[PDB]
Amino acid sequence: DIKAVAQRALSLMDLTSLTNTETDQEIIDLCRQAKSPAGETAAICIFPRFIPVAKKALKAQQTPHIKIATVTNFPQGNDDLDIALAETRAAVAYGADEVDLVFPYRALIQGNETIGFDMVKVCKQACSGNAKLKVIIETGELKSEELIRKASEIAINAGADFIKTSTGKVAINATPEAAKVMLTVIKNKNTAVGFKPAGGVRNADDAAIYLDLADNILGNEWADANHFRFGASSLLISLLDTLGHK
Amino acid sequence: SDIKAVAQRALSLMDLTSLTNTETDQEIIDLCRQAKSPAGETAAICIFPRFIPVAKKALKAQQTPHIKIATVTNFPQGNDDLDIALAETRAAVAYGADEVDLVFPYRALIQGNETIGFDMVKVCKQACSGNAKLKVIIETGELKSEELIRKASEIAINAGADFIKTSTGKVAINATPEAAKVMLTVIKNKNTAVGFKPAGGVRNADDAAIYLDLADNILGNEWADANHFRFGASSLLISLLDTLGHK
């Protein structure tokens, strides 16, 4: 049932806007859009400086349960620990519920597994008692199964609450192949860790591919809002269309 | 005053500013480079909060640790939402700001709400405790009247402002001699430890002399060092260096 899929995917969305030129009105408008005719998305995902305005709008429309996710070390995934930590500290101070941190994947590709652990760990510590930490490993740039698995393992060891496939800002983002690798790592290490495919999920058919992977690898009941998110934007209109809201 | 001497004096009091909100890392590094000028270092740079970590790294790499990093919050609108201004100020501190330039809720003051201005400046001052100085932009170009400019200054100072600053640079009217005179007089009458920062429309040494002469005459010759006086400006630097004969 494609409508059941669409309804389920909508409730797991991190409704994303990351143009870096948003106006405050566009952020208010995004929060309004997250309060959809078929229900609320799980979250929004926006740049840190927009969090106070978003928190205010979400509260005014009586949907404070819609989480505010943001991004740090983004999009490049540089290997500078001081900068990533400063941004994550600021994201928390802005009022973020969740921080989507970009893993230093280029450093990993060059054989440095240590900076990735260190960066994820100190940023996790900075979120303590305030926010969840998602870690973006950028699977489209890691390419190989070995690297995708390895980044996933390091991120979980260092304390990630979610592992996320992509920034959305590179050539290749979420893929079924990458998703299967990451979901499998989650199963083998810690089923408490969530999974977030981002970029390339545009309709209910795409959503079903990733939901079916999660259901088949981790069980039918695993992928709730605490364990599964879609990083997406245009997906919401497509899902609403599928659900009969043109 | 001697115009070249003023140029030299004014340069060391600059908060070299870039607030386009479309800067890249490279433009921030370049701003830091410019602040290390052939005539001496500016007192600070002033940039949006998210650029502070890159600026910090760049300032360290060119070995200019004493150039402070200032930023802006509640900016530029000066809205009267305390929670938003507080959260931005906390983030600015978390990013690593040395100084936070907060916009006072001046439209609320114009409508007769004097309390929100006090409360907002105070909680933001508290958020800076141990980490940063708080400057308060009262937007004199919008307050317009001497009475409102004096009142916003008094409120900012009572609530704990380390500096009072004339303008955001984002409205039609910014620093003016008239506004400066009122603000410097309030400082003189309430607390000479509070600094003054004319900002916006200061484009050359002639402009700078106006504000330095006012400070000198009202508070004394020794008063306006970098702890008590800043110029909020950008293209001013190039103008001063040209006046000083530097390339």
Author numbering:
A (entry chain B): 3 to 248
B (entry chain A): 2 to 248
Original authors' sentences:
The X-ray structures of both psychrophilic DERAs were determined with resolutions of 2.1 Å for C. psychrerythraea and 1.8 Å for S. halifaxensis. We note that the relative orientations of protomers as well as the characteristics of the dimer interface for both psychrophilic DERAs closely resemble the situation in the mesophilic (E. coli) enzyme. Comparing the substrate binding pockets of the new structures with DERAEC, no amino acid exchanges or significant conformational differences were found within a radius of 5 Å about the natural substrate (as represented by the covalent intermediate included in PDBID 1JCL12). DERAs from psychrophilic species had a similar thermostability and were around 20 K less stable than DERAEC. In contrast, helices 5 and, particularly, 6 and 7 show markedly reduced strengths of rigid contacts in the psychrophilic enzymes. The relative B-factor distribution of the backbone atoms reveals a tendency towards increased flexibility in helices 0, 6, and 7 of the psychrophilic DERAs, compared to DERAEC. Hence, our X-ray structures provide independent clues in favor of the hypothesis that adaption to low temperatures in psychrophilic DERAs involves a more flexible environment of the substrate binding pocket. While in DERASH and DERAEC the melting point of the oxidized form was still lower than the wt value, the exchange led to a marked increase of 8.4 K in thermostability in the case of DERACP. Further tests for the DERACP-A95Cox variant revealed a much longer half-life at 50 °C (>80 min vs. 1 min for the wt) and 86 ± 8% of the wt activity. Nevertheless, by installing a disulfide bridge in the interface of DERACP as a psychrophilic representative, the melting temperature could be increased.
